[PDB]
Design a protein around this ligand. Structure first.
Ligand SMILES: *[C@@H]1O[C@H](CO)[C@@H](O[C@@H]2O[C@H](CO)[C@@H](O)[C@H](O)[C@H]2NC(C)=O)[C@H](O)[C@H]1NC(C)=O
Ligand SMILES: *[C@@H]1O[C@H](CO)[C@@H](O[C@@H]2O[C@H](CO)[C@@H](O)[C@H](O)[C@H]2NC(C)=O)[C@H](O)[C@H]1NC(C)=O
Ligand SMILES: *[C@@H]1O[C@H](CO)[C@@H](O[C@@H]2O[C@H](CO)[C@@H](O)[C@H](O)[C@H]2NC(C)=O)[C@H](O)[C@H]1NC(C)=O
Ligand SMILES: *[C@@H]1O[C@H](CO)[C@@H](O[C@@H]2O[C@H](CO)[C@@H](O)[C@H](O)[C@H]2NC(C)=O)[C@H](O)[C@H]1NC(C)=O
Lengths: 269, 197, 166, 49
């Protein structure tokens, strides 16, 4: 980043030393934390549960959220809508997420299978099959409403649930801003990277932004001072950037701990 | 705990990070930052004060930038440590000083107790959790049509091994006989879906 | 190109450089599409592969065998296995998905296993335990365990303090 | 040994460690200058009637 394979910059950077090894350590920490976040959220189930083909859930249509086999990536229709909603050569690289999107899809599939067939006991110990009507009756007991209300209104509640799922489909398909937060995240990252790219065009007090131009124009004795100015500028930009992204990754980790707390409490109970 | 040291890895990492930062600071005293040397005494002994001032200005800018970078790193790290400490205090308040019904917030399984133990720059909770071990299948039913009146279990499950019917708890197997006090009556046995006799 | 120095894969360009457009530029003042000085003809640039070199190892005490993962580089360039994170040199690719130890990336992980060697595969997300659901079957626990787990939490850090002048 | 040097102190343990940066080095250097100025009628300064 600081220099496109210019040895004079390499040496004048050895003058500074660990100023970038620091940065690399920080960024590696960030990446590891990202991995940990993903595992915290999704890798809370132990065994991958699989839904049985018998969709006898008492009218609760779950096709729209259970994984569709036909798709190459085994993803639920809702997840497809979400995927459609959300849309250099200077050391700037994007490492791949350890968990592929398909493994995360299978994790959510296992979580749905657990919370549908076993309800919540799959999170405490081993999954315990239980008729979905009785599981919703236990949830109603948890709310404060008695089982009779559910069992007497099973069809009406099923219809309301299916219509609500349809409304969710419509809201996700039409209003892209429903996923705004995620988009913002991506945008922020992209913005930062782009700004880094653009920082390569600033002079920082030197004659040019191309170390090759400086070395071709000025003699090495003075080209060294100019390259020192340029290196200071670019290193300061890198420090600013890694600090921005450290703070942003801290915020992302906060939100990820919140999401894991949810996944544990609401989903698994 | 005795065998696997990595059980406390997190705490070690914390310490390591701190040490690392400090060591790096030490090593920053060896960088030139564009001056002739890293020893201001050497600069002053070599160069005249008029130019030694510019060289010392370069060195001071470098070392001050290193200090700013370091204090920023440690500000962020202390923010993270404060987040983890607020989490630990929330635990100490909920699980230790009570019983947290938040599922899997206090150990995988139904949380019974916890026991805090100090550790260098950290805490270790002995989350005592209930975990149901052995499982048995049973034929169940939402309600029971006794005399045309649907009978619902007051608290528990209607279970049936394959011959009789009983009422049990949702986390242990105490099959009790279905009296009129383990169940409450509600409506007829047609609105119910799956009611048995 | 007329003093313009730059490195990269030089392909041809369909990019319409109007006659006054000899060389292009990028967002980082780097030329992207160039042209010929002698016999005027247009060209494209893609800087050829740089990439990371990451070493996968079990513990040195366990073994000294190494699996070198080249990230952002296809070893078409440089027991070789192509991943999506990059490509491995020194690791046979097994198809049997096990619970993974050394996360390589893009879903692929490695581990030391037998003739002991480093093997790479795809992550087994867990034993595919299909729960036998039924509309009238329930599972009741008859016996339980009292398992105690350890939860480690960093509370404080070294309360350091620096003097600026010193 | 590269990894042992990256950790800068100890003997490596289980895991993966980013060590270095491979780069496909340029095969050679292409130099292309023009005759600078388009054309002059030397063929008439010499082969004049
Ligand atoms: C539950 O969801 C399924 C799947 O969307 C519905 O079945 C679809 O019905 C429409 C309209 O007849 C067809 O065009 C689709 O081809 C069907 N899909 C499949 C996979 O069969 C089903 O009708 C829904 N049930 C209710 C009551 O909402
Ligand atoms: C309670 O509200 C539900 C709707 O949430 C009512 O169910 C609707 O009843 C009307 C009239 O029969 C139907 O046209 C709708 O299609 C029903 N909706 C659903 C989701 O089934 C229900 O009748 C109401 N009950 C009372 C006693 O008011
Ligand atoms: C279901 O459980 C009941 C109660 O334990 C079993 O009935 C018992 O059967 C034994 C053996 O014949 C008798 O000695 C007991 O007196 C019976 N108890 C009752 C409540 O009558 C029943 O056999 C079990 N059914 C199955 C298929 O396991
Ligand atoms: C519980 O008893 C009722 C009443 O005897 C059973 O419902 C009868 O089912 C038979 C066979 O389908 C019908 O011919 C009768 O007309 C039904 N009677 C009524 C009043 O609906 C019911 O099937 C029994 N349930 C169980 C689990 O044995």
């Amino acid at each position: 980043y600081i220099c496109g394979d210019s040895t004079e910059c390499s040496n004048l950077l050895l003058q500074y030393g660990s100023f970038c090894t620091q940065l690399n350590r920080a960024l590696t920490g960030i990446a590891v934390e990202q991995d940990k976040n993903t595992q915290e959220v999704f890798a809370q189930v132990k065994q991958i549960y699989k839904t049985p083909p018998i969709k006898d859930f008492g009218g609760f249509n779950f096709s729209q959220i259970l994984p569709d086999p036909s798709k190459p990536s085994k993803r639920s229709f809702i997840e497809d809508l979400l995927f459609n909603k959300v849309t250099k050569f200077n050391g700037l690289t994007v490492l791949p997420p350890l968990l592929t999107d398909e493994m995360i899809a299978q994790y959510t599939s296992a979580l749905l299978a657990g919370t549908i067939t076993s309800g919540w006991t799959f999170g405490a110990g081993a999954a315990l099959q239980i008729p979905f009507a009785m599981q919703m009756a236990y949830r109603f007991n948890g709310i404060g409403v008695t089982q009779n209300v559910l069992y007497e209104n099973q069809k009406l509640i099923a219809n309301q649930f299916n219509s609500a799922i349809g409304k969710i489909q419509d809201s996700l398909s039409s209003t892209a801003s429903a996923l705004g937060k995620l988009q913002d995240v991506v945008n922020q990252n992209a913005q930062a990277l782009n700004t880094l790219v653009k920082q390569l065009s600033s002079n920082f007090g030197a004659i040019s932004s191309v170390l090759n131009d400086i070395l071709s124009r000025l003699d090495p004795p003075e080209a060294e001072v100019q390259i020192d100015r340029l290196i200071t500028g670019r290193l300061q930009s890198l420090q600013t950037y890694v600090t921005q992204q450290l703070i942003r990754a801290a915020e992302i980790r906060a939100s990820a701990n919140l999401a894991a707390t949810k996944m544990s409490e609401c989903v698994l109970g | 705990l005795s065998s696997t040291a990595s059980a406390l890895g997190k705490l070690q990492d914390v310490v390591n990070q701190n040490a690392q930062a400090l060591n790096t600071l030490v090593k920053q005293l060896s960088s030139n930052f564009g001056a002739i040397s890293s020893v201001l005494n050497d600069i002053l002994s070599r160069l005249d004060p008029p130019e030694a001032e510019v060289q010392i200005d370069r060195l001071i800018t470098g070392r001050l930038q290193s200090l700013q970078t370091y204090v920023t790193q440690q500000l962020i790290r202390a923010a993270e440590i404060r987040a983890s400490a607020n989490l630990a205090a929330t635990k100490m308040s909920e699980c230790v000083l009570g019983q947290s019904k938040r599922v899997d917030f206090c150990g995988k399984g139904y949380h019974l107790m916890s026991f805090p133990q100090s550790a260098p720059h950290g805490v270790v909770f002995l989350h005592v959790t209930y975990v149901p071990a052995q499982e048995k299948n049973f034929t169940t039913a939402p309600a029971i049509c006794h005399d045309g009146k649907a009978h619902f279990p007051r608290e528990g499950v209607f279970v049936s091994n394959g011959t009789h019917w009983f009422v049990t708890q949702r986390n242990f197997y105490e099959p009790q006989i279905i009296t009129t006090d383990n169940t409450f009556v509600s409506g007829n046995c047609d609105v119910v879906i799956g009611i048995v006799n | 190109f007329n003093g313009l120095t730059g490195t990269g894969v030089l392909t041809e360009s369909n990019k319409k450089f109007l006659p006054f457009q000899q060389f292009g530029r990028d967002i980082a003042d780097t030329t992207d599409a160039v042209r010929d000085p002698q016999t005027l003809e247009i060209l494209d640039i893609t800087p050829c592969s740089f990439g990371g070199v990451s070493v996968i190892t079990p513990g040195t005490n366990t073994s000294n065998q190494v699996a070198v993962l080249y990230q952002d580089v296809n070893c078409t360039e440089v027991n070789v296995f192509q991943t999506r994170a990059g490509c491995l040199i020194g690791a046979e690719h097994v198809n049997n998905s096990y619970e993974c130890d050394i996360p390589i990336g893009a879903g692929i992980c490695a581990s030391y296993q037998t003739s002991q060697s480093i093997i790479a595969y795809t992550m087994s997300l867990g034993a595919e335990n299909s729960v036998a659901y039924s509309n009238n079957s329930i599972a009741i626990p008859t016996n339980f365990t009292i398992s105690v787990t350890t939860e480690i939490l960093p509370v404080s850090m070294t309360k350091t303090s620096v003097d600026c002048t010193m | 040994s590269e990894t042992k040097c990256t950790l800068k102190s100890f003997t490596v343990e289980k895991g993966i460690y980013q060590t270095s940066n491979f780069r496909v080095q340029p095969t050679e250097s292409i130099v292309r200058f023009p005759n600078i100025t388009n054309l002059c009628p030397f063929g008439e300064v010499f082969n004049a009637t």
